[PDB]
Amino acid sequence: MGRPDGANGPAFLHAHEKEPKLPSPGPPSNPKQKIRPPVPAKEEKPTM
Amino acid sequence: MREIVHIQGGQCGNQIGAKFWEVVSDEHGIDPTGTYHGDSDLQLERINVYFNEATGGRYVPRAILMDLEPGTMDSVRSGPYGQIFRPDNFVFGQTGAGNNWAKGHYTEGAELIDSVLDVVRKEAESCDCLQGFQVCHSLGGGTGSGMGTLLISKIREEYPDRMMLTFSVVPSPKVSDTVVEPYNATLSVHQLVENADECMVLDNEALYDICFRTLKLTTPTFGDLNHLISAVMSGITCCLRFPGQLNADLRKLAVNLIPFPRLHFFMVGFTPLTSRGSQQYRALTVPELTQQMWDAKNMMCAADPRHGRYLTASALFRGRMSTKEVDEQMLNVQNKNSSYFVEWIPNNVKSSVCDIPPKGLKMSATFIGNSTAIQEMFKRVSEQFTAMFRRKAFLHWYTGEGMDEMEFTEAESNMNDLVSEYQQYQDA
Ligand SMILES: Nc1nc2c(ncn2[C@@H]2O[C@H](COP(=O)(O)OP(=O)(O)O)[C@@H](O)[C@H]2O)c(=O)[nH]1
Numbered sequence: 001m002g003r004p005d006g007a008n009g010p011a012f013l014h015a016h017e018k019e020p021k022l023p024s025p026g027p028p029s030n031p032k033q034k035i036r037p038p039v040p041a042k043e044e045k046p047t048m
Numbered sequence: 049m050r051e052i053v054h055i056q057g058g059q060c061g062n063q064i065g066a067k068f069w070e071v072v073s074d075e076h077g078i079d080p081t082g083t084y085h086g087d088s089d090l091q092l093e094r095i096n097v098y099f100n101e102a103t104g105g106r107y108v109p110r111a112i113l114m115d116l117e118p119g120t121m122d123s124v125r126s127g128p129y130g131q132i133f134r135p136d137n138f139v140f141g142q143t144g145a146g147n148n149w150a151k152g153h154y155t156e157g158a159e160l161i162d163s164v165l166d167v168v169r170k171e172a173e174s175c176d177c178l179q180g181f182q183v184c185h186s187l188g189g190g191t192g193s194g195m196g197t198l199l200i201s202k203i204r205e206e207y208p209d210r211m212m213l214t215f216s217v218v219p220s221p222k223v224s225d226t227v228v229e230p231y232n233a234t235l236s237v238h239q240l241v242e243n244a245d246e247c248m249v250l251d252n253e254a255l256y257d258i259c260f261r262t263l264k265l266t267t268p269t270f271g272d273l274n275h276l277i278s279a280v281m282s283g284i285t286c287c288l289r290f291p292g293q294l295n296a297d298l299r300k301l302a303v304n305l306i307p308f309p310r311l312h313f314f315m316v317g318f319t320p321l322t323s324r325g326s327q328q329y330r331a332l333t334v335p336e337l338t339q340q341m342w343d344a345k346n347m348m349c350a351a352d353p354r355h356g357r358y359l360t361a362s363a364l365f366r367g368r369m370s371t372k373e374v375d376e377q378m379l380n381v382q383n384k385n386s387s388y389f390v391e392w393i394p395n396n397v398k399s400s401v402c403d404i405p406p407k408g409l410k411m412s413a414t415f416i417g418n419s420t421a422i423q424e425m426f427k428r429v430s431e432q433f434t435a436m437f438r439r440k441a442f443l444h445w446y447t448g449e450g451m452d453e454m455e456f457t458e459a460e461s462n463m464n465d466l467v468s469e470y471q472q473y474q475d476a
Contacts, residue, residue, distance in 0.1 A: 040440050046453055047438040047460070 058192025152194015
C-alpha cells in the first residue's frame, strides 16, 4: 500500500545528503584463527 | 613335517606372491583347479610343507594375503592360479595406506593386526611341526612396511623359537618410485634388526640389469622380475621338499650364515640365466654355474661385493651331479680370490644339493652370501633420510598419526651402530 495522498510532497535536497562515510581503518573483529601451523625456521636441525 | 606358512604383505607382496605360487604349483603339478595332476609320487611326498589336503584330493596353499586397497585382491582372485587360495585367507581393508609408514604401522595397521593373527594361528596349529614363517615385503610402501613389520613384532612374541625369513624389497638408490621412500625404509629397518632371523635384500635395479644384460629382455615387465624372485624363494626349500645326497633344512642354513644375531642381511643370485640366443652356445656343466653365481652381476641387490668382504656364503644346487666337483669348485674360489674373504673364518661356504631340478631344466643352482658390501645400501638410504629429515620435510604426515620425533632418531642411530658392525668386522 502506498502513502496517503498529499504526503509524497517534494522535499528540500541539501548538498551531500547521500554520501557514504568510511568508518575508519580498524582491526577487524575476528582473524578467523588459521588452522595450519607455520613453516619451520630453517634452523631447527633435529637430526643427530 | 617341517611345515612352513607364507605371508604376503602389501601390493608387491600380493603381486609377487602370485608368481611364487604359480611356480610351486607347477613344480608339484597341480592344476589351477587345485586338483593334483602330476606324474610321480615325489610330488605328493612332501606336499604338506606348503599345502593342506581337501576333499577330492585338492591342495590349497597355506598362504596369508594381507593388504589394504582391495583393488589388488580382485587381481589375484582373477589371475590364473587365483582360485586355489582359501577365501578366508584374504585380509584386506577398504581404506588406502597413502604410502605412509605411520598409518600403516600406527592406526590402520593396529586394527587389522588381530584380524591377521586370528588367521595366522588358524594355520599355525594346522602344522604338525612348524618350521617357521616367511614374508614378502616391499620397504617402500605403507602396507608392506607398516603392517609388515607390525605383524612381525607380533609373530616374534608368540613364536620366538621358530624361524622367520624376509624377502624384503628395498628402496632403490637411483630409481625412486615415491618421494617419502627414505622414511618408510629406515623406520622399517629398525624393526627387522630385532624381530628377523634372516632377511634377504632385493632391489629392482639389479633386477633390471639382469633382465637387460643376461636375459637380454626387450620389455621387462613387473610380471617378469617376480619370475626371478619367485625362482629363488622356491630354491631355498628344495631340501625341505625333495631328497638329496646332501640335504639342508632351513634352520641349519641360518646358523652357518649369521655369526652374530644382527648381521642377517644377505645377497642372492640365481643360475643359470641365458637368452634364447646363447642357449646355443652354452654347456650345462657345474663350472658354468659356479662361475655365473660368484659373478658380481647375479647379485639381485645393487651392491658390489668387490667393495666389501664375504663373511660367509652358501650354494643350493639341484640336479643329479657330482658332489666332489661342487666342493673343489667352491674350494678354488676361496683360494684364488682370497682377499674378499675374512681371515677369522677358515671355511666360509656351505654347499647343498638336491636330486630334483626345476621342472623344465636339468641342472640349476642358487646363491646366498652374507657380505659386508651390504653396508653401501644402508649408507645410501641414510644420506637421503638425514637430508630431508634435517628440515622436517614431509614430517607433518608422520606426526599426525601420533608419532613423535625420537621415533626417527632411534631408527636412525639404530642404523648407525648397524652400519659400523659391518665395518669393524670388515678388516679390509
Ligand atoms: N619386483 C616387483 N616390485 C613391485 C611390484 N609392484 C610394486 N613394486 C614396488 O613396490 C614399491 C611400493 O610398494 P607397493 O607394494 O607398490 O605399495 P604398498 O602396498 O603401500 O607397499 C614400489 O617401489 C614398487 O616399485 C611388482 O609387481 N614386482
